[PDB]
């Protein structure tokens, strides 16, 4: 219903120019802590109104699509889209740092955790009695304004004693220990396989179409939920010119209630929990146990993307319960009142690296995100 937005002068690069096609994150002088000037982004968009953003690049060879999605930084790092407007980071240590008059925020790094084993460490610089941080894991659903842990879209641990955070509650289930100005936390997140994920997601799609559906029309929400595939993508990602640059708006997931399903076996409303998950933390190398084992399964039938419920029902038509390759848990970080935390990406900057062959570095799946982004859109280019 809308035409493809045409290119502009800076969009057609040439061999010689060394400028970077997603226009650089313009930084702003935030404050001085840890003997370092950190910086908030000033002129690059943030994720709002239940959107996620990504700088597009005009890709000249492509015909139906005229653009490609792109990230800014070379290796894996924080995507500056799902963060807060007072959340500062410097080009020196990549530690996120809010000012002392700013509160509990959240910052997500762009690497998705979908299946397999991913491990990385997170450096912690300045955690005083007055400045705090909450490191851990979250989906794309967890609002980066609130700190991770109020909901079932993220989990983390406290700074002092590492009280494990879910539903806002503080749980002393691990070994209690406090952060200081020099620790580093490592994350053995064991995930189920995408085959095992797909069947438990398909099971709920069958267990939700009619099994509790005996609202004024229940066929079309069943029809949308027929039409509920495990790994298939429905993406509406469109190029836009914002602030004199070029970007994508991607449809984002909404908050919803707890996935409950009546198993006739044990006679109790059972919770959907992922298979064989483990949330192990390193405290300077030592292991501390499994914080959570029952991670949510999310892939079609637990994440509702943004949907026009009065436009589509009346009628060609998209679906709520889809994938968009951004679906899963992320490297999630928070900061409070000057509490600084830095994310470590590569094996060369890791000190306590366990010896598993299934472990791949944080930069690795980032490249697999680089691998997935173009070729899924090449498939959508036909």
């Amino acid at each position: 219903s809308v035409p493809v937005i045409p290119y502009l002068d800076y969009d057609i690069v040439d061999l010689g120019s060394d400028i970077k096609k997603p226009d650089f994150p313009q930084l702003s002088e935030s404050h001085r802590i840890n003997e370092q000037q950190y910086y908030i982004t000033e002129d690059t968009p943030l994720n709002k109104r239940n959107f996620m953003y990504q700088p597009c690049a005009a890709n000249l060879m492509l015909d139906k699509l005229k653009y490609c999605g792109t990230d800014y930084f070379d290796k894996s790092s924080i995507n500056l889209m799902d963060r807060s407007d007072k959340l500062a980071f410097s080009l020196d240590d990549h530690s996120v740092s809010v000012s002392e008059n700013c509160g509990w925020r959240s910052v997500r790094s762009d690497v998705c955790m979908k299946e397999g084993k991913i491990y990385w460490e997170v450096e912690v610089k300045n955690v005083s009695d007055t400045s705090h941080i909450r490191c851990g894991i979250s989906r794309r659903e967890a609002s980066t304004e609130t700190p991770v842990g109020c909901d079932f879209y993220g989990y983390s641990i406290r700074d002092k004693g590492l009280q494990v955070i879910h539903e806002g509650r503080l749980h002393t289930v691990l070994k209690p220990h406090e952060m200081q100005a020099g620790d580093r936390i490592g994350f053995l997140l064991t995930l189920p396989s995408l085959q095992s994920q797909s069947e438990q997601a398909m099971d709920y799609s069958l267990k939700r179409i009619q099994e509790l559906n005996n609202k004024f029309n229940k066929e079309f929400y069943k029809f949308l939920l027929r039409s509920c595939e495990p790994t298939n993508v429905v993406r509406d990602q469109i190029a836009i010119r914002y602030k004199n640059q070029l970007f994508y708006e991607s449809t984002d997931y909404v908050k919803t209630t707890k996935p409950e399903y009546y198993d006739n076996r044990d006679d109790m409303q059972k919770f959907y929990e992922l298979e064989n998950s483990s949330f192990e933390v390193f405290v300077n190398g030592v292991s501390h146990g499994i914080a959570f084992e029952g991670l949510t399964p999310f892939l079609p039938p637990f994440s509702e993307l943004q949907y026009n419920e009065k436009f589509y029902l009346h009628h060609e038509i998209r679906n709520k319960y889809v994938n968009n390759n951004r679906l899963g848990y992320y490297a999630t970080l928070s900061s409070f009142q000057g509490g600084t935390a830095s994310i470590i990406t590569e094996a060369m900057e890791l000190k306590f690296l366990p010896k598993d062959v299934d472990i791949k570095t944080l930069n690795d799946i980032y490249n697999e995100q680089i691998a997935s982004d173009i070729v899924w859109d090449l498939i959508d280019e036909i």
């Binding site: 700013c102 509990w104 700190p147």
Partner: protein
């Protein structure tokens, strides 16, 4: 007085600015005088009444002068005893009726004088200084142990003639000495006679300030400042020093520069006289003035009424200004008007006036044998007053209340 302890704070401002009350008294009134506590308001009237109001509902509790000793002529002045129980009232009927509220309508005792009267001023509840018309001495009316003989000692040394100094017309007893009484002649000299409460009277001060007909002399309640109201359009506040041996000096002068008008009555604040309040005389004088007695300047103007005002009373316990109408007879009243607060609704409410930047703490995302006494009443209030010396409440006329339902 426990309203003001939690009213809350923000009521000490040392004047009232809004007129809140109006005693719609049909029979016009000259002098008004509050009770020593904030309870009652005596209203000296023109046709010989002395109406006495209860200040809480703006409606009278009695009008004395029914049984014995009604002021037949107009009443010029009324003072009260130190407690608030008796009441000396000097009128133009040549009598000086001392009342007792215990037996309300019946006068306690009176005395026939040499002429009409200007004022009265009560030093101890019995003794009272009364100004006889055009007499160079004031006849102090000491109510002795016997009720028939009031020794009217001349308030004058035996041979010091004040012909050329004037004629005594005002006398205000000193509060913190109580034995010196300063009296004002009619040609600018001010005599200061110290009673021994024998009758010896030392002339502690005789001096002309200006060749004017002295209208009124007032003292601060700490005796520190003394102000005079000449017949020239000037108010002369002094600085009073006494141990006896007494001495004043000209602190400041107050005058109507624009309108160049006369001053009717003047009055001082509670503690040390930080404020003077005066009522102008001429046409278009619709408002009392205020003066910062140290800086000397016109601080505020109390724009309430509609036409000239004659007498000023300031009972600091209620922080009120009663001010009688010169023309209508109506009795305007200013009052420190507190506004309510909705923070009284709940014990955790709070009334801010700015969009405050609440700063985030942590847990917004995280889910008796002490000394008890019942015996001592409080000694002071937020104004530093002499509370807990129990004032003489009015005895409601319980001899005549039983008919008082039927036909007054």
């Amino acid at each position: 007085a426990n309203l003001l302890l939690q009213d809350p704070f923000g009521v000490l401002k040392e004047y009232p600015e809004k007129l809140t009350h109006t005693l719609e008294v049909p029979v016009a009134a000259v002098c008004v005088k509050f009770s020593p506590r904030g309870d009652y308001l005596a209203v000296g009237c023109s046709n010989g009444a002395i109406i006495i109001y209860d200040m809480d509902s703006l409606k009278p509790i009695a009008m004395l002068g029914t049984h014995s000793g009604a002021h037949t002529r107009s009443v010029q002045s009324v003072c009260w005893s130190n407690d608030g129980r008796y009441l000396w009232s000097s009128g133009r009927d040549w009598y000086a009726k001392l009342w007792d509220m215990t037996q309300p309508t019946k006068c306690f005792q009176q005395y026939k004088f040499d002429g009409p009267l200007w004022s009265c001023h009560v030093v101890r509840w019995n003794v009272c200084i009364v100004t006889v018309v055009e007499e160079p001495t004031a006849y102090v009316l000491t109510l002795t142990d016997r009720q028939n003989a009031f020794h009217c000692f001349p308030l004058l040394e035996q041979d010091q003639d004040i012909s050329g100094h004037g004629y005594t017309l005002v006398a205000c007893p000193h509060p913190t000495i109580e034995s010196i009484i300063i009296t004002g002649t009619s040609k600018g000299w001010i005599n200061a006679f110290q009673l021994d409460l024998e009758d010896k009277i030392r002339c502690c001060y005789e001096e002309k300030i200006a060749n004017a007909n002295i209208k009124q002399i007032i003292i601060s309640p700490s005796g520190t400042r003394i102000a005079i109201n000449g017949s020239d359009r000037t108010i002369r506040q002094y600085q009073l020093i006494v141990e006896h041996s007494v001495s004043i000096e000209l602190e400041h002068k107050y005058q109507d520069i624009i309108n160049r008008l006369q001053w009717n009555t003047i009055f001082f604040s509670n503690h040390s006289g930080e404020y003077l309040v005066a009522s102008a005389h001429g046409s278009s004088a619709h408002d009392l003035y205020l003066w910062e007695t140290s800086s000397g300047s016109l601080v505020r103007v109390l724009e309430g009424a509609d036409e000239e005002l004659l007498d000023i009373d300031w009972n600091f316990y209620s922080m009120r200004i009663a001010s009688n109408g010169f023309e209508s007879g109506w009795v305007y009243m200013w009052s420190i008007v507190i506004p309510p607060k909705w923070s009284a609704l709940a014990p955790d409410f709070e009334e801010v006036e700015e969009n405050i930047d609440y700063q985030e703490k942590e847990n917004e995302f995280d889910i008796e044998e002490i000394a008890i006494d019942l015996c001592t009443p409080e000694k002071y209030d937020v104004r530093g007053n002499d509370i807990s010396m129990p004032s003489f409440v009015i005895p409601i006329d319980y001899e005549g209340v039983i008919i008082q339902q039927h036909w007054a």
